[PDB]
Design a protein around this nucleic acid. Structure first.
Lengths: 105, 48, 86, 97, 95, 57, 81, 97, 94
DNA sequence: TCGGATGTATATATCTGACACGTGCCTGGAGACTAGGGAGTAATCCCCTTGGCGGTTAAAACGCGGGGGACAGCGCGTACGTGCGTTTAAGCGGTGCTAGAGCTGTCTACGACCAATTGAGCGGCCTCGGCACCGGGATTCTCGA
DNA sequence: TCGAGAATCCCGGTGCCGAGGCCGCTCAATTGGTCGTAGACAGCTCTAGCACCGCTTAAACGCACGTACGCGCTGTCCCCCGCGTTTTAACCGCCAAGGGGATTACTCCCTAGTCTCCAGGCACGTGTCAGATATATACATCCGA
């Protein structure tokens, strides 16, 4: 008789912690009853997206444990994640390899 | 800018713009301290 | 007394392979000789506009130490969001 | 008697520095800079270390973005050598001044 | 002698279910922790300003959906909207 | 706003005076950073090299 | 259904905006590039305006929705609503 | 047989347009533009009028700021005539692309 | 008969006639000043609420409003508005 | 076109110290109930938006003719990389000590909460002066000699 | 060094419609109480920060020095700009018809809140392998003759 709402919806991120963060956060007077579920789904999807583009760079550069340089490249190589994370300095980041084409000899 | 706003500007900044000091030409003279562009107001020559 | 804080340098402490080194992380081929003074000026302006808000949160919290969250909060206000210290 | 044609060392250092990530400015002169300009707002503070590292990361990223937009300006003016009127143009356009 | 609101075990489990044979370091875990907190704050705050604009006093699934459609860019927005609607329907049908 | 409204010889205040009153000042322009006043207009500004100059005689 | 209205922005009107910008002399490609940039900006505003209008169930885009979208953009129009 | 030296009409129009404030683009072609590109997101909407005026003010201010930063670029390249690589440079530097 | 709406028109009228004797105002200028005061109120209340969440307190005192004004306003204008606020509160107490 | 002469990914042996994993335990997250209050839904009316038709004309469109800036070509020496040698401050271990950050009871006084009261403040409706327009003289630069 | 000339700012008449103000009339601000817990405070740890120390060494600075390209100059040319003549749709002013948006009234059922109970996450103690580091080593590639 202990079915957590993560099981009852099928997701992985919790919904009780999201419900407590909504009621404590003073964002509005009445938290709904499906809104923290929906938001747990959205957070699970974006985490899955960034880790999916991380793992490709991880296997391409032969390591097996993801580092912030892999995260920097996994974010900055994409077209629309670069517009999402508009200006974010990621620690240990580095930049994309790019040389202007009017300086090659 | 139109005229009376710059007249207000004049009454503001004519104290800090210029200065009277010992000239080598003849006795004293009016120096200049702030770098003036060609066209602005400098001071109002007012008295009785 | 007891406090020895007579400091005049440390704008020169950002030395002069260092701005060259940042420029060649940036992908820059050939640099003039006034870029050094101009870069030191811009760096001083930016670090002032962050340290001001950092010390303001540190005073308002009624503490004496500027923890990392306060720096993250200052940079969050500026628009340059920083990840990886909370 | 063996010396390179000039520019080769420049391009290979560009690739050599873009293929790595680390702190690039030496840390104790930057820490003394931060404490010296923090003197003027509240006397005798007490920093941590991670706040200093966060400041170094923010300043490093800001300078790198500034130099890349400067280099775009200098290539636009049909030149190669960066002159400081380019930097002043970039900070005039971006809106920080 | 305290507690702490980390998301480490959750990103562990999602990483297990998206790549069967890799792990993740500490600093990357902290970056993902701050990333999820930041995305949560932006979406919740946009939703709350919607609730204040429309003179109503309850955040619901429809307001979270409109915060998602405003904040995210296009293709990723359609993906996240479909994921959320699937999760809500599978929550409430077998409720 | 009132100073500019007198100094253009008008009774009331129309928003052109507000645009001039903010953008002539230094600190209020930094406060109203990303702001467009409706019906505002801009400051009169012409660059230094777009206007001719005379050499001979 | 409509057509051709991006050419409704004329040749002198772009020249008039250039003169208020304080511009001496224009080339002949600025017209094409200007229509491109203006169409991009109008799409990026009208998307969020219509998103607010669909959320509040109405079929009308008032001035308050436009001002909310511009508040999100970072431009903050005054003088309406 | 009386004609000006070229450029005089340009400078006097610059002062003549900076000494005034009004709507500058003719209003009905801009309204038809706004309705035509609003077709693609939701069919058969119903605008007010003040929303259209707000859009016209926002677009007018954005174009004026863009042209002034373009003119700064074109003066920086030791030219006078604006060419569209200046505009593309300005929108590359500002961060909108 | 319409539903009563908020506005700050009368108070701008009063401050305008206290600082200029014979200078009126238009309609559009009144809407601009209304939206201006709404903007400054939203920004300062947002900063104070975020401070209250950071410090693990739950109550907006005057201290957070002073801190928010010192953060958000640039320099000398802040050093005058702090004095205006403190003088008004101390004249309110006694 | 080649030789040489550089630095550059590349196969392997060893460590470590940072990361994967039991465990217990607890405190916050599932189960039940209860009221009441925010929100769904019908109806309306009346406000506003959209559409259409003729009239004037301000303004866009479009050739003409040209001369002034954009651009290509060319010469130099000032200024900046490249390398080599010659100092120094930056890391880096251990130590200590200690000011201060953080944590536990304890007790108020200050703000929530609710009942009854009126005057500050918005809506509708006048009135009238600043501003808009018309028209003419003084002025003030430009452009061919 | 001039003078034709074409806008242009300054100045005062005629008209009108946005703005300031005044009465009426609500409904939210004000006053007067209770009552609880959020917070101010005294005290009590114990842990990171700052200062100190020697030692080692990558790194920074000075100095030649060759060189290449930013800058200056000249030519040429073509395309953008003033302008005269010609259409055309922007606008205004209007009537007209109907979609939809605030608005109120009314059930209603979804959630704030309370009480009970118990396992999911977390702090903590484990061992142990992913990639760093070291060492040769074929191999890409820059530059003169």
């Amino acid at each position: 008789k202990a079915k957590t709402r993560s099981s009852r919806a099928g997701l992985q991120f919790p919904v009780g912690r999201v419900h407590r963060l909504l009621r404590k956060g003073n964002y509005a007077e009445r938290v709904g009853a499906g809104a923290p579920v929906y938001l747990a789904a959205v957070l699970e999807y974006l985490t899955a997206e960034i880790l999916e583009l991380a793992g490709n760079a991880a296997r391409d550069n032969k390591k097996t444990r993801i580092i912030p340089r892999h995260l920097q490249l996994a974010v900055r190589n994409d077209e629309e994640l670069n517009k999402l994370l508009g200006r974010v300095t990621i620690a240990q980041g580095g930049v994309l390899p790019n040389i202007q084409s009017v300086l090659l000899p | 800018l139109p005229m009376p706003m710059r007249f207000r500007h004049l009454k503001k900044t004519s104290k800090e713009a210029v200065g009277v000091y010992r000239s080598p030409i003849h006795g004293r003279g009016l120096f200049c301290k702030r770098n003036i562009d060609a066209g602005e107001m400098v001071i109002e020559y007012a008295g009785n | 007394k007891r406090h020895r804080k007579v400091l005049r340098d440390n704008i020169q402490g950002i030395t002069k392979p260092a701005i060259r080194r940042l420029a060649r992380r940036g992908g820059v081929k050939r640099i003039s000789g006034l870029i050094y003074e101009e870069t030191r000026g811009v760096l001083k302006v930016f670090l002032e506009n962050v340290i001001r808000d950092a010390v303001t949160y540190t005073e308002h919290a009624k503490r004496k130490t500027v923890t990392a969250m306060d720096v993250v909060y200052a940079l969050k206000r500026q628009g340059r969001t920083l990840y990886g210290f909370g | 008697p063996h010396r390179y044609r000039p520019g080769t060392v420049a391009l290979r250092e560009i690739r050599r520095y873009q293929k790595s990530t680390e702190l690039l400015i030496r840390k104790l002169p930057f820490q003394r800079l931060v404490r010296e300009i923090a003197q003027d707002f509240k006397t005798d503070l007490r920093f941590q270390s991670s706040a200093v590292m966060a400041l170094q990361e923010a300043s490093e990223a800001y300078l790198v973005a500034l130099f890349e937009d400067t280099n775009l300006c200098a290539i636009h003016a049909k030149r190669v050598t960066i002159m400081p009127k380019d930097i002043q143009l970039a900070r005039r356009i971006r809106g920080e001044r | 002698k305290t507690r702490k609101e980390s998301y480490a075990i959750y990103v562990y489990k999602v990483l297990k279910q998206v790549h069967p044979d890799t792990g993740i370091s500490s600093k990357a875990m902290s970056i993902m922790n701050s990333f999820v907190n930041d995305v949560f704050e932006r979406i919740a705050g946009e939703a709350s300003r919607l609730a204040h604009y429309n003179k109503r006093s309850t955040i619901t699934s429809r307001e979270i959906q409109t915060a998602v459609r405003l904040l995210l860019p296009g293709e990723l927005a359609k993906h996240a909207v479909s994921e959320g609607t699937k999760a809500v329907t599978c929550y409430t049908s077998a409720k | 706003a009132g100073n500019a409204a007198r100094d253009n010889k008008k009774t009331r205040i129309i928003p052109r005076h507000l645009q001039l009153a903010v953008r002539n000042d230094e600190e209020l322009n930094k406060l109203l950073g990303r702001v467009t006043i409706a019906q505002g207009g801009v400051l009169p500004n012409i660059q230094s090299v777009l206007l001719p100059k005379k050499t001979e005689s």
